[PDB]
């Protein structure tokens, strides 16, 4: 490649063709895989010149080369992205969204995605400069299938970055403006478009329940459930995240997920070979079992209690923690008959085995579940049968030893259990 000093000499020549050759040389240097010299390019003072080249309508090659060079600077650290914004790039890129040249409008989409992807402040600044209307205009075609694949994938990714990040979440009016286009992308048949649309929906549903409501009222839950069954892990992962976020909301929002048939996919998700899928599927189950008794009953009817026994018995420890929460929520909210059923499915032994975990939070969760199950047994007059079960599979020794445990809540709750039922 060229040296930075030679690039600087060409860019400072005031000869447009020399500037174009040098900008292309910078693009190629910034495109190399190992440590592109972003900081050297910034320190040479080239960003303002690249931003001025974005405006050269009569020289579309230098618009493209500078757009690509700035895209790659903005793909770096926050300080590097800030150098691009400080150079005036945001309005210049928004102006290029109108370019008659698809490869230039695409590169402007890409650069704005990196700028907005830096964090909430630059996301909101891109929105304030008016990026959403011209971005959405690029997708205002009757059938997305007429657009080139790579172009559509870059637009979907940039829109997903306008949905991303919190503190604050994106402006409500901006979300309302984007959502109809995002729902169209969520029904497109390209796996990368589907994955990034699913990620965008997942960001929009991670937050207060009013944000969940805005998404669920667009009718996306059935499509998310379809995507939960996809064979591509890059689609299943964000589809499950979005479903998981939705069931953190109201009981009615959770019911939409159940009504769409989500629970029928969970035998597969709760045994998926990818640890993170098992983990987030068990997290999802734990928020469903925090639901109404009729929602717990659907978990039962779908045969999922054995699957929860299974993940509590053997899984990565983070998944086992989510399983313990699922059991504590189930026993907190469930009917006596639902809790009897949980014991008949075999929960006691794997619950007791996890009391050996060197993790204070999961111990507290498990002791809470045990107390809830004892309260069910009191209503049936069967606390003795339960005490026997817990002792025979080694649980009494562990609870007895947790009396001498450091944490406050642990030794309290464990003392209580022994005093009342042992």
């Amino acid at each position: 490649n060229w040296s930075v000093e030679d690039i600087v000499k060409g860019i400072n020549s005031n000869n447009l063709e020399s500037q174009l050759q040098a900008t292309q040389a910078a693009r190629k240097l910034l495109s190399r895989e190992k440590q592109p010299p972003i900081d050297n390019i910034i320190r040479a003072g080239l960003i303002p010149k690249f931003v001025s080249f974005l405006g050269k309508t009569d020289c579309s090659p230098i618009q493209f080369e500078s757009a690509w060079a700035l895209t790659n600077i903005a793909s770096g650290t926050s300080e590097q992205t800030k150098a691009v914004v400080d150079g005036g790039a945001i309005p210049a890129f928004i102006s290029l969204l109108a370019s008659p040249h698809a490869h230039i409008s695409e590169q402007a989409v890409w650069a704005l995605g990196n700028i907005a992807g830096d964090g909430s402040a630059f996301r909101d600044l891109v929105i304030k400069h008016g990026a959403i209307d011209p971005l959405l205009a690029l997708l205002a075609v009757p059938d997305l299938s007429t657009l080139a694949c790579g172009y559509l994938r870059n637009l979907t990714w940039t829109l997903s970055n306008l949905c991303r990040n919190k503190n604050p979440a994106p402006p409500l009016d901006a979300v309302e403006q984007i959502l109809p286009t995002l729902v169209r992308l969520l029904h497109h048949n390209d796996p990368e478009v589907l994955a990034d649309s699913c990620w965008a929906i997942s960001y929009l549903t991670d937050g207060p329940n009013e944000r969940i409501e805005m998404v669920v009222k667009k009718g996306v839950v059935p499509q998310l459930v379809k995507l939960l069954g996809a064979t591509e892990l890059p689609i299943v992962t964000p589809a499950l995240r979005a479903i998981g976020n939705i069931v953190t909301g109201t009981d009615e929002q959770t019911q939409k997920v159940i009504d769409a048939g989500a629970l029928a996919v969970f035998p597969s998700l709760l045994t998926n070979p990818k640890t993170n899928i098992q983990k987030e599927a068990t997290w999802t189950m734990s928020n469903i079992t925090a639901g109404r008794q009729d929602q717990i009953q659907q978990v039962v009817n779908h045969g999922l209690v054995p699957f929860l026994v299974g993940v509590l018995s053997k899984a990565d420890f983070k998944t086992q923690k989510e399983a313990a929460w699922a059991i504590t929520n189930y026993t907190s909210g469930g009917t006596v008959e639902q809790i009897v059923y949980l014991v008949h499915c075999g929960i006691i032994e794997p619950l007791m085995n996890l009391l050996s975990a060197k993790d204070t939070k999961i111990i507290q969760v498990i002791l809470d579940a045990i107390s809830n199950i004892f309260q069910a047994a009191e209503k049936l007059g069967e606390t003795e049968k339960l005490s026997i079960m817990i002792e025979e599979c080694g649980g009494l020794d562990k609870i007895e030893a947790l009396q001498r445990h450091e944490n406050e809540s642990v030794y309290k709750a464990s003392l209580n259990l022994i005093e009342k039922y042992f």
Partner: peptide, 22 residues
Amino acid sequence: SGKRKLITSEEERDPAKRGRKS
């Protein structure tokens, strides 16, 4: 009251930015 919203850390999240290599 038992709902638990998503918690993530920085290492589990994947980058929001993408450079163009070719």
